[PDB]
Design a protein around this ligand. Structure first.
Ligand SMILES: CCc1[nH]c2nc(Sc3cccnc3)nc(OC)c2c1C=O
Length: 191
């Protein structure tokens, strides 16, 4: 279960200091680049929000909104079961809250999780939008778990540039809004 992650997060993300904190960002990001390398998205946006929560947003197909063979939505399986989206449930387990916003085929979806991965209600259709297809994940890391919940902008920029090195024609932006004015870096290549 997700309790195993909270009991021994070191066996899942290496440590719960600054290193482990930033690792949470990379887990969600890698799912976006997986999608980019599959298809399927010309930009990945990473935003450090004012409340020290992280948003990771892509322009991919959008996380599947249908029922999983186990009898709960595929969105929920990805974020609540370990054992597509490796690391997503780990991030969910170690966050105070997390929500996923999905836009698929002109309809927008959302689901919220709290207290280490407990679903708040269920997956919901919000209503039709003109927005492009994509998945957006916001989460606030659990401060009772991490030694520090204070994201380094420099560390994120260096590692996202590295993730951009992997990619052709997809643009990775980092935004810090903590932060009286929106500070940001952009990386894109090329061939
Ligand atoms: C914003 C980060 C993110 N973005 C994502 N986009 C897709 S899109 C997709 C992938 C496979 C099958 N169908 C849709 N799927 C995902 O999980 C499987 C994610 C995902 C998971 O964290």
């Amino acid at each position: 279960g997700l309790e195993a992650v909270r009991k021994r997060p070191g066996m899942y993300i290496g440590s719960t200091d600054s290193r482990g904190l930033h690792h949470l960002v990379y887990e969600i990001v890698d799912n976006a680049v997986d999608e980019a390398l599959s298809g399927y998205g010309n930009e990945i946006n990473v935003t450090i929000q004012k409340d020290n929560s992280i948003c990771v947003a892509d322009s991919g197909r959008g996380m599947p909104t249908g029922m999983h063979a186990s009898g709960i939505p595929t969105v929920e399986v990805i974020f609540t079961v370990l054992h597509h989206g490796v690391g997503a449930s780990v991030v969910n387990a170690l966050s105070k809250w997390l929500e996923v916003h999905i836009v698929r085929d002109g309809v927008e979806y959302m689901e919220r999780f709290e207290d280490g991965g407990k679903p708040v209600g269920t997956l919901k259709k919000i209503g039709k939008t003109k927005k492009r297809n994509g998945t957006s994940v916001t989460f606030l890391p659990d401060d009772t778990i991490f030694s520090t919940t204070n994201f380094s902008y420099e560390i994120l920029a260096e590692r996202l540039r590295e993730s951009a090195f992997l990619l052709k024609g997809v643009k990775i932006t980092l935004t810090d809004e903590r932060g009286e004015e929106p500070k940001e870096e952009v990386f894109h290549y090329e061939e």
